[PDB]
Amino acid sequence: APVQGIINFEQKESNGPVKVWGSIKGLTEGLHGFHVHGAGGDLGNVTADKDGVADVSIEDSVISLSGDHSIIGRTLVVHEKAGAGAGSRLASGVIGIAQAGAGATKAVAVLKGDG
DSSP: OOOEEEEEEEESSTTSOEEEEEEEESOOSEEEEEEESSSSOEEEEEEEOTTSOEEEEEEESSOBSSSTTBOTTSEEEEESSOSSSOOSOEEEEEEEEEEEOSSOEEEEEEEEOOO
Protein backbone atom coordinates (compact mmCIF):
# COMPACT_ATOMS: atom_id res chain seq x y z
CA ALA A 1 0.00 0.00 0.00
CA PRO A 2 0.96 3.67 0.13
CA VAL A 3 0.92 3.43 3.95
CA GLN A 4 3.89 1.47 5.30
CA GLY A 5 5.87 1.45 8.52
CA ILE A 6 8.10 -0.44 10.90
CA ILE A 7 7.53 -0.18 14.65
CA ASN A 8 9.94 -1.64 17.20
CA PHE A 9 9.17 -2.62 20.81
CA GLU A 10 11.83 -3.21 23.50
CA GLN A 11 11.54 -4.32 27.11
CA LYS A 12 14.44 -5.09 29.45
CA GLU A 13 12.47 -6.63 32.35
CA SER A 14 9.19 -8.51 32.89
CA ASN A 15 7.16 -5.56 34.24
CA GLY A 16 9.61 -2.89 33.00
CA PRO A 17 8.55 -0.12 30.61
CA VAL A 18 8.34 -0.74 26.86
CA LYS A 19 10.24 1.48 24.41
CA VAL A 20 8.26 1.92 21.16
CA TRP A 21 9.96 3.46 18.15
CA GLY A 22 10.05 3.54 14.36
CA SER A 23 8.45 5.39 11.46
CA ILE A 24 5.26 5.23 9.40
CA LYS A 25 5.22 6.59 5.84
CA GLY A 26 2.55 7.36 3.25
CA LEU A 27 0.21 9.03 5.78
CA THR A 28 -1.84 12.19 5.30
CA GLU A 29 -0.58 15.22 7.24
CA GLY A 30 -1.83 15.43 10.84
CA LEU A 31 -2.65 13.26 13.86
CA HIS A 32 -3.30 9.52 13.46
CA GLY A 33 -4.71 7.16 16.10
CA PHE A 34 -2.11 4.59 17.13
CA HIS A 35 -2.81 1.54 19.29
CA VAL A 36 -2.82 -2.21 19.78
CA HIS A 37 -6.14 -3.80 18.82
CA GLY A 38 -8.13 -4.81 21.92
CA ALA A 39 -7.95 -3.63 25.53
CA GLY A 40 -4.97 -2.00 27.27
CA GLY A 41 -2.91 -0.88 24.27
CA ASP A 42 -3.60 2.81 23.64
CA LEU A 43 -0.40 4.38 22.27
CA GLY A 44 -1.98 7.81 21.72
CA ASN A 45 -1.56 9.57 18.39
CA VAL A 46 1.31 9.81 15.92
CA THR A 47 1.96 13.02 13.98
CA ALA A 48 2.66 12.77 10.25
CA ASP A 49 4.55 15.71 8.69
CA LYS A 50 4.00 17.29 5.24
CA ASP A 51 5.99 14.44 3.64
CA GLY A 52 3.49 12.01 5.22
CA VAL A 53 6.13 10.60 7.56
CA ALA A 54 5.43 10.05 11.25
CA ASP A 55 8.49 9.40 13.40
CA VAL A 56 7.56 7.42 16.51
CA SER A 57 9.43 7.38 19.85
CA ILE A 58 7.53 6.64 23.04
CA GLU A 59 7.78 4.75 26.29
CA ASP A 60 4.76 3.07 27.82
CA SER A 61 4.38 1.15 31.09
CA VAL A 62 0.84 -0.17 30.46
CA ILE A 63 1.76 -2.49 27.58
CA SER A 64 4.21 -5.38 28.03
CA LEU A 65 6.07 -7.96 25.90
CA SER A 66 5.57 -10.73 28.49
CA GLY A 67 2.84 -12.04 30.82
CA ASP A 68 -0.94 -12.12 30.36
CA HIS A 69 -0.94 -8.48 29.19
CA SER A 70 1.67 -9.30 26.50
CA ILE A 71 1.10 -7.55 23.16
CA ILE A 72 3.17 -10.19 21.33
CA GLY A 73 0.97 -11.63 18.58
CA ARG A 74 -1.55 -8.78 18.83
CA THR A 75 -2.24 -6.43 15.95
CA LEU A 76 -0.75 -2.93 15.88
CA VAL A 77 -2.98 -0.39 14.16
CA VAL A 78 -2.66 3.13 12.78
CA HIS A 79 -5.71 5.03 11.52
CA GLU A 80 -5.08 6.17 7.94
CA LYS A 81 -7.75 8.87 8.36
CA ALA A 82 -6.27 11.88 10.18
CA GLY A 83 -7.94 13.23 13.33
CA ALA A 84 -9.55 11.56 16.34
CA GLY A 85 -12.59 9.26 16.54
CA ALA A 86 -13.39 6.09 14.61
CA GLY A 87 -11.96 5.07 11.25
CA SER A 88 -12.16 1.87 9.20
CA ARG A 89 -9.16 2.52 6.91
CA LEU A 90 -6.24 0.96 8.80
CA ALA A 91 -2.61 0.18 8.21
CA SER A 92 -1.78 -2.75 10.48
CA GLY A 93 0.56 -5.58 11.35
CA VAL A 94 0.98 -8.38 13.85
CA ILE A 95 3.52 -7.72 16.61
CA GLY A 96 6.17 -10.42 16.15
CA ILE A 97 9.06 -11.55 18.33
CA ALA A 98 12.54 -10.43 17.29
CA GLN A 99 14.60 -11.45 20.34
CA ALA A 100 13.73 -13.14 23.64
CA GLY A 101 15.72 -14.29 26.70
CA ALA A 102 16.56 -14.22 29.47
CA GLY A 103 14.64 -11.21 30.80
CA ALA A 104 14.95 -8.90 27.78
CA THR A 105 12.57 -8.94 24.80
CA LYS A 106 12.41 -7.22 21.41
CA ALA A 107 9.46 -7.20 18.98
CA VAL A 108 8.66 -5.73 15.55
CA ALA A 109 5.42 -4.83 13.76
CA VAL A 110 5.50 -4.29 9.99
CA LEU A 111 2.58 -1.97 9.19
CA LYS A 112 0.85 -2.28 5.81
CA GLY A 113 -2.37 -0.64 4.61
CA ASP A 114 -4.28 -0.89 1.32
CA GLY A 115 -4.11 1.22 -1.86
